[PDB]
Amino acid sequence: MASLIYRQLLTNSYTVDLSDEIQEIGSTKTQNVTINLGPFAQTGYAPVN
Amino acid sequence: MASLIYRQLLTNSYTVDLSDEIQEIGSLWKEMQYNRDITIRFKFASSIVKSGGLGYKWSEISFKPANYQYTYTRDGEEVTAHTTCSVNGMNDFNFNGGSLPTDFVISRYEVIKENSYVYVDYWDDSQAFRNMVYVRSLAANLNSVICTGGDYSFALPVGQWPVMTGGAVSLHSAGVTLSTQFTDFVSLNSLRFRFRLTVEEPSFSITRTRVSRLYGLPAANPNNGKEYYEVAGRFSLISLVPSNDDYQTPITNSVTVRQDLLGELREEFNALSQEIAMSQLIDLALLPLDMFSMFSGIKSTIDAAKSMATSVMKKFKKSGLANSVSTLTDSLSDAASSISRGASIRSVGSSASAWTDVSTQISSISTQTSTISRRLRLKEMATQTEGMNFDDISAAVLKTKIDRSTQISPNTLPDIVTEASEKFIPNRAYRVINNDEVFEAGTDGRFFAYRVETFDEIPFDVQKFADLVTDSPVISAIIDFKTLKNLNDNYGISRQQAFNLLRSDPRVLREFINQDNPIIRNRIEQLIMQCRL
Amino acid sequence: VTVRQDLERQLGELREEFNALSQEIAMSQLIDLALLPLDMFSMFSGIKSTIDAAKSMATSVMKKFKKSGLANSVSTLTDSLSDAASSISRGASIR
Amino acid sequence: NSVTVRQDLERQLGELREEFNALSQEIAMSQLIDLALLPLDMFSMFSGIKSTIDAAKSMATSVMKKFKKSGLANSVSTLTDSLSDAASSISRGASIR
Amino acid sequence: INLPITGSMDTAYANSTQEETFLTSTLCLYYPTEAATEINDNSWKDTLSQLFLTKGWPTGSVYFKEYTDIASFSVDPQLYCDYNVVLMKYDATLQLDMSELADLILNEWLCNPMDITLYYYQQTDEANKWISMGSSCTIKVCPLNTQTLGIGCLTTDTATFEEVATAEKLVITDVVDGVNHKLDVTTATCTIRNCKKLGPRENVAVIQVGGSDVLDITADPTTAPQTERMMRINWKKWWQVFYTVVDYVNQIIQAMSKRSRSLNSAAFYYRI
Amino acid sequence: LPITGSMDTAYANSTQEETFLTSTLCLYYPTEAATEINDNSWKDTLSQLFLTKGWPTGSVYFKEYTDIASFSVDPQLYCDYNVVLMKYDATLQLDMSELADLILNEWLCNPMDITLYYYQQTDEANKWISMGSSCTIKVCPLNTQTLGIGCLTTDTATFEEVATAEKLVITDVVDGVNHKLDVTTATCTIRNCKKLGPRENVAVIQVGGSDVLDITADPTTAPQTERMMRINWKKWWQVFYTVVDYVNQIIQAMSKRSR
Amino acid sequence: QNYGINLPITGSMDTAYANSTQEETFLTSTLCLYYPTEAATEINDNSWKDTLSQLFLTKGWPTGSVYFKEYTDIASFSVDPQLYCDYNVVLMKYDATLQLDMSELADLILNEWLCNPMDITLYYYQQTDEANKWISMGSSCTIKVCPLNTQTLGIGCLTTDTATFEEVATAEKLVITDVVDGVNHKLDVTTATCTIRNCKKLGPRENVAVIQVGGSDVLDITADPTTAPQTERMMRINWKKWWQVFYTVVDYVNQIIQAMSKRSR
Ligand SMILES: *[C@@H]1O[C@H](CO)[C@@H](O)[C@H](O)[C@H]1NC(C)=O
Ligand SMILES: *[C@@H]1O[C@H](CO)[C@@H](O)[C@H](O)[C@H]1NC(C)=O
Ligand SMILES: *[C@@H]1O[C@H](CO)[C@@H](O)[C@H](O)[C@H]1NC(C)=O
Ligand SMILES: *[C@@H]1O[C@H](CO)[C@@H](O)[C@H](O)[C@H]1NC(C)=O
Ligand SMILES: [Ca+2]
Ligand SMILES: [Ca+2]
Ligand SMILES: [Ca+2]
Ligand SMILES: [Ca+2]
Ligand SMILES: [Ca+2]
Ligand SMILES: [Ca+2]
Ligand SMILES: [Ca+2]
Ligand SMILES: [Ca+2]
Ligand SMILES: [Ca+2]
């Protein structure tokens, strides 16, 4: 039991590979973040000559 | 234990679903010593797409893959190298001065931050980049670079110019994988690194606007006029060159493999079957050879080491074994629930029990016994047994063969593990003990009733053997009645030894096997030769 | 905007279905089934129709399982055992 | 948006060993023997520890990936390989008796 | 406390007080301006904090109190921390100054004010000295005789008084113990106090960054001791000195022990 | 292996007058001494003097060195008994202490590849020793995710300078953090070295000022060993006659190596 | 004489009450008064100190055991109060606009604070208990705080724009700040003209005695808004002159010193 935790770590060691696959694949298939603009509108000046 | 490994495969089947999800959303031997040095010179590209109107508005300032081809010196030879740099996972900002046609608008422009990742495929005409077809391990230690953005002016035909300036991020090397460059007639195997981005002090800004103190690197001028950015380090790589009798080390790796396609793997197994010993096999058939211990001694390839257990599981949950297990569980559930309209097919026993429901009969007692014994194989990997638990011996043979057999591969071990689990000891017998009266049974339609102390047969009491095998623990027939009686006759046997052989105890089993008892050696050799594939 | 409740009526209908199917259960076969090491596969393969190409059901059930009284009580018990094992100067203060 | 949120340094493993040596001996024995009869599975062992983290990114995997690099696991695999080899055909080494 | 304590030699007790405070320690370095001058960095304090974090000290526990010069630091040194380290540079023309600073901070003092004009003071034991602090302390002393006259000096002509301090900020004066002295001090710019030496201050640690051990903490010339919390280093840069201190702070902290008498901020107690 | 013994046995004869005949002695003196002496046969003289103490003529060697730093640059001490004479200079205190820390103690040294790898110190004895004609070292500690602390992993100007134009350097940094370095690899080679048990075969003799050597980087011990000796001088012939006459004490304070 | 340790004490209930240590504690102790400039101003006498000393001499306190130490104003007194005597008395005038400052003064002197330093440029600080406060001294302290969340970001404030911080003090000579215990705060302070120190309130100081001269009792020593206690050495008087006040103090100096008790630390 309290050594079954070590046995379980050993048994479930395979998930290290799945986690590495996550790390390598998600970073190739991540979607570009899009910002929610503020409630204002970033106006400024007009074209000055 | 050795059946616990099958139980664990079935249990951990739930990871196959997420593994397939990941794969979908994504989409004699020897050893050679890389840990060679490299220097990667690369650069970014940009893709600017302006809108019409008067010329004050842009609709995209985005990144783009960028190739590069150069030459450098290493160990005294000029090597020509080729890089390809791209990015993923960027923040798309936008500026908007108004809806009028004359107000500065950038509807979308990309910036790479700490949540982004850049990929730099690399290649050269050295020997490693043609030898890296079968890799065992890959990892690289490279220095970092600091890439900064330069001045960029927007060509407004009227008024003052907006000046994009600042911005910088630090690339440190974290992660190495394989990839391919696709040419017109052949393909090239390449090595793509992944750098993580760490933002730095210089804050990007857009002059003559309300944008300032904004960190990151945009796509406008990421190179700041620099012809390239240069990292330098070492890449460590191990190979699986299929060499031979210990000379003539290949170069270019000089091989093809079984991808051109089991017909010969079966012959390999049938050649390795009998060479296996018995005492050491029984010593190995008591070990809980969980996933790690079963898949450690395999000197896998870089992809098999990542997906071996899941690879065998995704086929192990497709087989007669798994389907029969699910069928049994569905039968038990529907029997516990359907009682009002109860399935009245048959019940050889006191009352209805899914373990005792004969069906698909395409002697009567022989048929009943075989049909009841075809579910004790499920009892074995349902933990209601007591003895050497034949699937355990099967798994021990499996683990003793797949560590020797040269022909083992990522596509290959899956459905070999399952063909083994399905075709190892097809015919196999079991027993149940009740008040010093043993009732045996076998899937070959044979039954034997007999007393423990004085082996002498008895009429086989069906409707009692079933009532006992349903609930009481079961035992395996490694020491089955025929050999047991031959032994009690010739090699005169004691009460405790006989009780332990009934219980199928490995201590007494291995003690006879070391006492050189041919009436047990022959039986164990029969079990081996049946574990043939 | 965001909702403040959901799924309650469906869960109620399933409550009714369960509290009406309960009585038709049999006892002999239930005792026969209660001695079965019904692992994840054994419990999630024999679903009525595997209705439509479902997600990983083990993960789906576990992400709700580890928020409930059972798991939190397990964690509380383990924490209490560790805290009682840690110190000797407290004097078995749980009475 | 900052320069970066650095991750502060953690410890010197010598000093962490000395923190253990400071918690050398004050464990209760009845309570320890009552604790050592429990299946303290991954959830139970990684839930209560320090009760504060946002990431939660599979620290059981993070400890397993360092667990399967050590003497214990290598010795287990060595033993299994030795058993399978010796069983199948393999010659016993002259030093092995 | 007067009551006794008991013990044993077989036990393995493990039973001891546990409580809380400010967060299990504090530490304060006292470094010269020259160090930050040579370094020329504005993030080195945070660098050293994150280094100490590896040795265990949390973020809000390490502090630095720059001091321009040994004399400036000697002028009212206000130490209020649970551990104090004092880096101190070697200068053969300042031996007495950086031994008086040591005799002041390493040892615990109990000081009473003094009124030079209205009274004539004296010392009782070999631990009752006179410490004077300020900006420029010029002290002069005339011993006296049984009949309240002078000895090689005159009660009226201050020039006849014997000089013991010239242009010093901190002075620790020991005179003959058992005779009445008459004093003349620059009371406008300096304050003098009749102090008594007590058990040592285990909360400070001096680190002579440079030359060999010179500090004679004990005014008597026969001992010339050297304590565990009296360290030496050889230096050519300051970054290496600080990295050394950080790599070996656990030994510094094993050599220092928290106070026993009470809490206080200065280098001496006031008891009127 | 284990070694037993007893207290009833008797003391054996004096290994002196045989260790002298079957061992070698090697003095390391500065050019200042040869200059002040201004003689060509002083070596023959001192060897003929040693010949009275018992050291034969082909056993004593004199290995001049122009300066303490030029000596500290790769000192190849290969003799069965080594004596070093070291002048005192406050401006050279740390250099003449590092020389002691290098020769008196025996170092297990591995090489170092800065440009490709980042290193850390494990224990209090795993230090970094750099030798060459002019070393200029700078160090940048890192965090768990390879980011700099008060420095930038690329910008060498932001690094922390610990040595400047030093021919020998012994660098101890915080033990447990990964550092990046910048060193004049052209002119200086740097090794990662663990300090083993002391070298009982060399004897430093400081010809001038007070005892300043602090071998122990930890500022708590400041130990003074048996073979770290001192002399006060106004000439060099007196120093050499003192060495000659009290060589037996020096060779009793030294003990032949075990490795 | 085991200092640095704390041992079980024991006694009995049959021992008799010993003699009166009064008329000896007065001789082997010292008494320091702290009056305001307004008192000597109203008085306009040069020998009032010798007068009060010759009066104390009747009560038992000898001539050179009494000390008077002036202070122009309550805030100038709050600026680094250095009370080093064996029995301190502090006569305090009432002003409804100065209530908070003359309560902070009380919470600072009546109690015994264990004070560690603070450096704002490097760290971000949090409180651990309800008695771990931040006391700021100086000539003009302008203190602003920005609490942070779990991920080191402000709450209604930005970690660059100091104007968005939350203000708790504005040009105060003494401040005592308590904030939410469990959250890290970023601080802005006038370090040049003010020192801030993170202090833990230990048990009280039984060596000082505050005497309010005017208005009703208002001093809330305990920062928590539940107790509002009135300690034993927290005295009140009603005044129209100062000679009457000094005569009252002198005539009832024994009750004062009975309410006080020589320190422990
Ligand atoms: C057949 O197997 C035996 C033992 O299993 C071995 O000794 C023999 O060499 C094998 N035959 C051949 C031709 O290799
Ligand atoms: C300390 O605790 C142990 C076990 O809790 C006990 O045996 C021992 O007597 C205690 N110490 C003392 C001094 O009582
Ligand atoms: C040791 O010395 C004594 C007296 O000098 C001498 O008699 C003896 O022979 C010596 N030992 C040996 C082994 O010669
Ligand atoms: C205690 O007080 C009584 C009554 O005043 C007095 O007689 C006695 O002498 C006092 N004790 C001492 C020791 O003086
Ligand atoms: Ca002085
Ligand atoms: Ca005179
Ligand atoms: Ca004296
Ligand atoms: Ca040097
Ligand atoms: Ca070190
Ligand atoms: Ca720097
Ligand atoms: Ca105030
Ligand atoms: Ca509070
Ligand atoms: Ca605000």
Give the DSSP per-residue string, chain G.
--TT--------SSSPP----TTTTTTTS-EEEE-BHHHHHHH--SSHHHHHHHHHHHHT--GGGEEE--BS-HHHHHSS----SSSEEEEE---TTTHHHHHHHHHHHTEEEEEE---TTT--B---STTEEEEEEEEEE--EEEEB-TTS-BSSS-SS-GGGSEES-SSEEEEEE---TTS-EEEE--TTTEEEEEEEEEEE-TTEEEEE-SS------SSSTTT----TTEEE---S-SHHHHHHHHHTHHHHHHH------
CA atoms within 13 A on the CB side of B138: 24
| Cβ count near B133 (within 10 Å) | 17
Whole-number Å distance between alpha carbons of E165 and E173: 9
Please name the residue that has the structure tokens 């798309």. B92
B159 chain-A contacts, CB cut-off 8 A: 47-49
Residues D42, A5: C-beta atoms closer than 8 Å: yes
- CB contact G240 to E (< 8 Å): no
Whole-number Å distance between alpha carbons of G124 and G247: 51
What is the CA(G101)–ligand 11 centre distance, in A? Answer: 4
Of F149, F162, F219, the CB nearest to E239: F162
Residue B160 φ then ψ, to 5°: -90, 160
Q: Please calculate the CA angle C79-C83-C87 and round it to the nearest 5 degrees.
A: 170
List binding-site positions of E for Ca(2+): 41, 123, 152, 160, 162, 174-175, 177, 247
What is the CA(E96)–ligand 5 centre distance, in A? Answer: 6
Asked if residue F112 lies in contact with residue F58, where contact means CB atoms within 8 angstroms, the answer is no
Q: Are strands F82-86 and E181-184 parallel, antiparallel or unpaired?
A: unpaired
Give Cα G212 distance to the centre of its chain.
13
User: If contacts are CB pairs under 8 Å, which of residues 8-27 in chain A contact chain D?
Assistant: 8-10, 12-13, 15-16, 19
Counting ligands in written order, the one closest to the CA of E161 is 6
Q: Å resolution of this model?
A: 3.4
B94: three-class secondary structure by DSSP: strand
E172: three-class secondary structure by DSSP: strand
Q: Are strands E269-270 and E107-113 parallel, antiparallel or unpaired?
A: parallel
Asked if residue B111 lies in contact with residue B221, where contact means CB atoms within 8 angstroms, the answer is no
Give Cα B496 distance to the centre of its chain.
45
- CB contact F206 to E (< 8 Å): no
E50 chain-D contacts, CB cut-off 8 A: 8-9
Of E60, E81, E260, the CB nearest to G4: E260
> Cβ < 6 Å from ligand 2: which residues?
C 88; E 13-15
D75: three-class secondary structure by DSSP: helix
Structure tokens at E179: 């005779």
Counting ligands in written order, the one closest to the CA of E94 is 5
Structure tokens at G1: 């004489």
Whole-number Å distance between alpha carbons of F200 and F198: 6
Dihedral over Cα of B500, B501, B504, B509: its sign: positive
- CB contact A19 to B (< 8 Å): no
B199 chain-D contacts, CB cut-off 8 A: 1-4
Whole-number Å distance between alpha carbons of B162 and B400: 72
Radius of gyration of chain B (CA): 34
D vs F, Cβ pairs < 8 A, gives 23
Nearest CA to ligand 2 atom 7: E13
Structure tokens at F33: 């001494």
CA distance F188 to chain B (A): 21
Q: Please calculate the CA angle E98-E104-E108 and round it to the nearest 5 degrees.
A: 155
Please name the residue that has the structure tokens 């032949």. F256
Whole-number Å distance between alpha carbons of A8 and B325: 24
Whole-number Å distance between alpha carbons of F115 and E199: 54
Q: How many residues does chain D have?
A: 97
H helix or E strand, kind and range, residue B497: helix B495-502
Radius of gyration of chain E (CA): 22
Q: Please calculate the CA angle B352-B357-B358 and round it to the nearest 5 degrees.
A: 150
What is the CA(B218)–ligand 13 centre distance, in A? Answer: 31
The contact set of D with F (CB < 8 A) is 4, 6-14
Residue type, B492: G
Residues D26, C86: C-beta atoms closer than 8 Å: yes
Give Cα E222 distance to the centre of its chain.
21
Of E207, E243, E252, the CB nearest to F174: E243
**Nearest residue in D to C78, CA atom:** D44
Give Cα G26 distance to the centre of its chain.
23
Find, among G214, G218, G238, the residue nearest to G230 by Cα: G218
Q: Are strands F166-171 and F160-161 parallel, antiparallel or unpaired?
A: unpaired
Mutation site, D38, D64, D80, interface A, largest A CB count within 10 A:
D64
B169: three-class secondary structure by DSSP: strand
- CB contact D79 to A (< 8 Å): no
Mutation site, A25, A43, A49, interface B, largest B CB count within 10 A:
A43
What is the CA(E101)–ligand 5 centre distance, in A? Answer: 8
Whole-number Å distance between alpha carbons of G183 and D7: 19
Give Cα B484 distance to the centre of its chain.
42
Residue type, G115: C
G224: annotated binding-site residue? Answer: no
Residue type, G123: Y
| Cβ count near B422 (within 10 Å) | 17
Q: How was this one solved?
A: cryo-EM
Residues B11, C40: C-beta atoms closer than 8 Å: yes
Residues F143, D4: C-beta atoms closer than 8 Å: no
| Chain F: partners with 3+ C-beta pairs within 8 Å | B, D, E
Nearest CA to ligand 2 atom 11: E13
Nearest CA to ligand 2 atom 9: E13
Of A8, A15, A16, the CB nearest to D41: A8
Nearest CA to ligand 2 atom 2: E15
Chains G and C touch (3+ CB pairs under 8 A): no
Whole-number Å distance between alpha carbons of B79 and B124: 7
> Which ranges constitute the DSSP H helices of chain F?
31-37, 42-53, 68-72, 93-103, 237-245, 247-253
- CB contact E47 to F (< 8 Å): yes
Residues E54, D26: C-beta atoms closer than 8 Å: no
Asked if residue G188 lies in contact with residue G94, where contact means CB atoms within 8 angstroms, the answer is no
B531: three-class secondary structure by DSSP: coil
Give me the numbers of helices (H) and strands (E) for chain F, helices first please: 6, 12
CA dihedral C12, C17, C20, C21 (to 10 degrees): -140
Mutation site, B40, B74, B114, B144, interface F, largest F CB count within 10 A:
B144
Q: How many residues does chain F have?
A: 259
Dihedral over Cα of B48, B51, B52, B57: its sign: negative
Structure tokens at E35: 């160090």
CA distances in angstroms from B104 to B61, B204, E60, F227, listed in the order given? 14, 18, 48, 81
Asked if residue E129 lies in contact with residue E197, where contact means CB atoms within 8 angstroms, the answer is yes
What is the CA(E36)–ligand 10 centre distance, in A? Answer: 12
Asked if residue B241 lies in contact with residue B29, where contact means CB atoms within 8 angstroms, the answer is yes
Please name the residue that has the structure tokens 């309240």. E148
Nearest CA to ligand 2 atom 13: E13
Asked if residue B432 lies in contact with residue B502, where contact means CB atoms within 8 angstroms, the answer is no
D83 chain-B contacts, CB cut-off 8 A: 280, 283-284, 287
Counting ligands in written order, the one closest to the CA of G20 is 4
E55 chain-D contacts, CB cut-off 8 A: 12, 15
Give Cα B237 distance to the centre of its chain.
22
B37 chain-F contacts, CB cut-off 8 A: 116
Whole-number Å distance between alpha carbons of D45 and D62: 14
Q: How many residues does chain B have?
A: 533
Residues 6 or more apart whose CB falls under 8 angstroms from that of B247 comprise none
Please name the residue that has the structure tokens 């008695």. G131
Residue type, E220: D
B403: three-class secondary structure by DSSP: coil
Residues D54, G151: C-beta atoms closer than 8 Å: yes
G179: annotated binding-site residue? Answer: yes
Counting ligands in written order, the one closest to the CA of E160 is 6
Find, among E25, E242, E33, E29, the residue nearest to G119 by Cα: E29
D61: three-class secondary structure by DSSP: helix
Please name the residue that has the structure tokens 């204002």. A40
Dihedral over Cα of F79, F82, F85, F86: its sign: positive
Residues B89, A32: C-beta atoms closer than 8 Å: yes
Question: Helices B14-26 and C57-65: crossing angle, nearest 10°?
Answer: 110
> Which ranges constitute the DSSP H helices of B273-362?
279-284, 291-294, 309-316, 320-337
Radius of gyration of chain F (CA): 22
**Nearest residue in E to D10, CA atom:** E54
Nearest CA to ligand 2 atom 8: E13
B14-28 as b/e, with b when 16 or more CB fall inside 10 Å? Answer: bbbbbbeebeeeeee
C87 chain-E contacts, CB cut-off 8 A: 18
The contact set of G with D (CB < 8 A) is 150-152
H helix or E strand, kind and range, residue B129: helix B128-131
